[PDB]
Amino acid sequence: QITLKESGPTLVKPTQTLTLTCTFSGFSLTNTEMTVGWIRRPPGKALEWLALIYWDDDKRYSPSLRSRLTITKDTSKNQVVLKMTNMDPVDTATYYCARLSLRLLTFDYWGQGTLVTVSSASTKGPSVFPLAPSSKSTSGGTAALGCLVKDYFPEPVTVSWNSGALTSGVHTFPAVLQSSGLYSLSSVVTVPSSSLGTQTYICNVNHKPSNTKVDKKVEPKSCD
Amino acid sequence: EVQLVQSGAEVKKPGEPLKISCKASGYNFANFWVGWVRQMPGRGLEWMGVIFPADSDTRYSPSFQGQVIISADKSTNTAYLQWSSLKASDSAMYYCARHVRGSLWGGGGYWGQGTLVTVSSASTKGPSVFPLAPSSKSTSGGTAALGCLVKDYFPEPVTVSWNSGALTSGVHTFPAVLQSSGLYSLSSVVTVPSSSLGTQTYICNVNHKPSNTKVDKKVEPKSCD
Amino acid sequence: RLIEVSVEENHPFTLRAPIQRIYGVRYTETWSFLPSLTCTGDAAPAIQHICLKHTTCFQDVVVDVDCAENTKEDQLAEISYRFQGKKEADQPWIVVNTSTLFDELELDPPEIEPGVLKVLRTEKQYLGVYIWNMRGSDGTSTYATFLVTWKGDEKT
Amino acid sequence: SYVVTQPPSVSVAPRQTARITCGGSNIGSKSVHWHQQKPGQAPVLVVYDDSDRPSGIPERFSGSNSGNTATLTITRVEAGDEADYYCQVWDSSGDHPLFGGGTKLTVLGQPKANPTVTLFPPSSEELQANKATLVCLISDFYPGAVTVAWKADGSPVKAGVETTKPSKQSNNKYAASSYLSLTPEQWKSHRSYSCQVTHEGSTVEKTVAPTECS
Amino acid sequence: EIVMTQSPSTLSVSPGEGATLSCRASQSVNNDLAWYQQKPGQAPRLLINGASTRATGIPARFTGSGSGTEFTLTISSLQPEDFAVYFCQQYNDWPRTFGQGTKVEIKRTVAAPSVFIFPPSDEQLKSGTASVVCLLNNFYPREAKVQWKVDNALQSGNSQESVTEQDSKDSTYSLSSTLTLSKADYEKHKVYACEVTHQGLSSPVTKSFNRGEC
């Protein structure tokens, strides 16, 4: 089996330098048929080629962005590093690292990629609030209640409902762009009316750029 | 550059053997093709054969096999053509040619100057001159023509001049025709205005090298005595 | 061990060499020549079964001493590439041609492609012996030797 | 450099056959491959090196390569086949891989269902921070063409109103969110805030008032 | 034996204009055709080899095209030095056949000829056979018929004719016709006459003389 993973930062200020790491396992670059490449994806645009590295320190660079790339390999620890300097706001994208075989000239195995975002803001934590179910929202005996985080930066937020055990009836809406340019999201769960008072609902939010872990319980609102 | 030279003109008699030489200089003689071509007045231009002066390999034309022999000399870089018995139908011009490139399938790249071979049963003779006299019946718009007729000479060529070279303008000298008897005849004519019929003296000169003849003859009005 | 090939005038011919390539290794190919234009008849190189003292017996081409002294080793063409793909339109190669032997003879240089040498119109200036060599970036070397002579000389 | 062009968008009615073409000047001699990727997912390979199959790839995908055509044909098409497809080649002049522009497949003709509309207000502690952001939630509707309207007792509200492009999830449906932010005092000032969702002539309205409990 | 035809047999192209010569073969000869040019009293020179290539030093005005069994050579601008004979040759199968040839002349206005008749002098009478001569000078084109009318009847079988080349200044022509007889044969008849028929002249013209006339 072949395994590829990606790591690095997520926020880059304008005209600074960006570094990213792609790690691989299941093969060795000492073999003379394997190459490692990097590509990127803008919002709803074409998969763009960035760079390619061989076994013999050969380099293949994109014609459009040739002057501003660097790619290096380390066979001892099975690592590949990419450096891309002079960031631009319109270059926000998602970047992927993949494997290529010289016997077919087509990319076979891919990773998961990572987000690269350019902005002039600062890291902010979560503002977590419980969204309680309402009587009008109870249709067919099902009520929706959840955990809403607002005023956070940047994308994304890793959400665990009861430590990820519950996977049915979970709606985690995509983030939104406010007039203030601040994302806001909410993870909700729809449960039967009879089970409203018998099951414990706890949201866990983990934020890798800010390495923050926040746990909050959701309960229905009580009149006072 | 490229240089191909040939030998002099040949006059012979039937029943005698002959050999001609074509010299080449200016390249590597071994790895190229050289061959011969014949031009005769009455059947056009024909190919005869080629040689490759590195293995002496030969391929004659179907028609000419067993009539000639083609050989090459790598020392002095010369091609040779040999006959067996000169027949009366072997009087023509001959050329030696080297191919444009190193392949067998190519045209004639570089040529020589040509060898003229003439065979006839007659012997050397000297020409006789006669006056084509001017007259009143020889008038066309006030201009009268007069000339010299050279007959019964062998072999070619014969030089004709008019009045030592002063009257070279308006002259006309037709080619030579071989008569049945085996001797050539030709004419030369010039035109003069009728106002100078008796003033200028017209003396035509004929020179013949093989017969060593130099004859000057006068063209004058034919008096009705 | 050498290959025997027979050709005829005005008939094309082609030489192909056994190749065992491995993807990803930078590879170089070299072609050579050894003519017999001035070596005709018994002086021309010939195939003989050369036998060792007790064990080895193999075919080899013997060249006359005078013919060998009159023959100089020459380079016809050199190719450099890397093995990749299955088709041929996806395989780029870099060719270096320093062969001046056929330029002075005013002939057509042979058509060389990876593993193949082809001549369209055979003449008497193409006969002789050919040497083919393959080398790689992993330390592998392979040699082969072809012999082209006139048709009909095999029986004699 | 080689140039490869493919049509941008092709729509196929349900359960039919779809053919996507990768074409270029003398494209038969070159190998052309297919890469598939759904939104918000890692790309996957389906067809490589002129119509063979890797393990796990569905059998409804077929490839043909001849002349100036490389055709990818899918039969028995579901909604789950709605994804982004690319044709990739190895450009020899630059000796590097080259991707295309991408093709999007549209699966119309799906059954039509009325949207589910919910409205939820900010909690107590959110109001304690002198902020209020009420969220409307639209789920299980198709197609993804809704209009979100905020009515304060019938008066349209356009201040601080955000509506998002509905998002596809794993069940081949779309879902959308809407936000409207005011001060807690502003929230308490109004009488009835109604979220209305319009979908193919179907209007679903849900109203809420600060007087009642949440 | 491969045979060839050259077309057409004669050209008359004014300066500035161009010319097209056709060479027709019998069997297929592939691309093995050559074109040569020959002038009065000089060795032929190579113009075209391989039916498409130009030899070293050959001007671009000569373009050679065609294939199979038919070939053509075209000249755009005719310099004053380009009127000569042109031959086509094949080198596929032996015998290697040539062409008869095509001649290029200079076109000009038709000019009536000047006709003279010369009787034999006395020296030819004493020495033996006598010769009478008819002369045509400064005419164009070449076609012109000269006949001898001994006594009052057409004489034939005893006339020799010669013609010169193009005039270097006015492209006019000249021909000479000689009739030979024996002394007794000359003395036996009374009147000798020369008849000339030419395209330019309205009617044939006859010049006659009698023995004993100066």
Residue numbers in the entry:
A (entry chain A): 1 to 224
B (entry chain C): 1 to 225
C (entry chain E): 170 to 325
D (entry chain B), E (entry chain D): 1 to 214
Text lifted from the article:
Among these glycoproteins, gE plays a crucial role in VZV viral infection, serving as the most antigenically potent and abundant glycoprotein present on both the viral envelope and the membranes of infected cells. gE is currently the sole antigen in recombinant herpes zoster vaccines and has relatively high protective efficacy. VZV gE has a unique N-terminal region (aa 1–188) that binds the cellular receptor insulin-degrading enzyme (IDE) and has been identified as immunodominant, underscoring its significance in the antibody response. We report the identification and characterization of nAbs obtained from a convalescent patient.
The overall structure of the gI-binding domain of gE and Fab WLL-1/WLL-28 complex resembles a V-shape, with the 2 antibodies binding on opposite sides of the gI-binding domain of gE. The structure reveals that Fab WLL-1 binds to one side of the gI-binding domain, with a buried surface area (BSA) of 683 Å2. Fab WLL-1 mainly interacts with a loop formed by residues 191–195, situated between β2 and β3, as well as another loop encompassing the α1 helix formed by residues 251–261. Fab WLL-28 binds to an opposite side of the gI-binding domain, noncompetitively with Fab WLL-1. The regions of the gI-binding domain interacting with Fab WLL-28 are primarily composed of loop regions, including residues 273–276 located between β5 and β6, a loop region containing the α3 helix formed by aa 290–294, loops between β1 and β2 (aa 178–179), and between β3 and β4 (aa 206–209). Five hydrogen bonds and 3 salt bridges are formed between Fab WLL-28 and the gI-binding domain. Despite recognizing distinct epitopes, all nAbs effectively blocked the gE-rIDE interaction, suggesting that their neutralizing activity is primarily mediated through interference with receptor engagement.
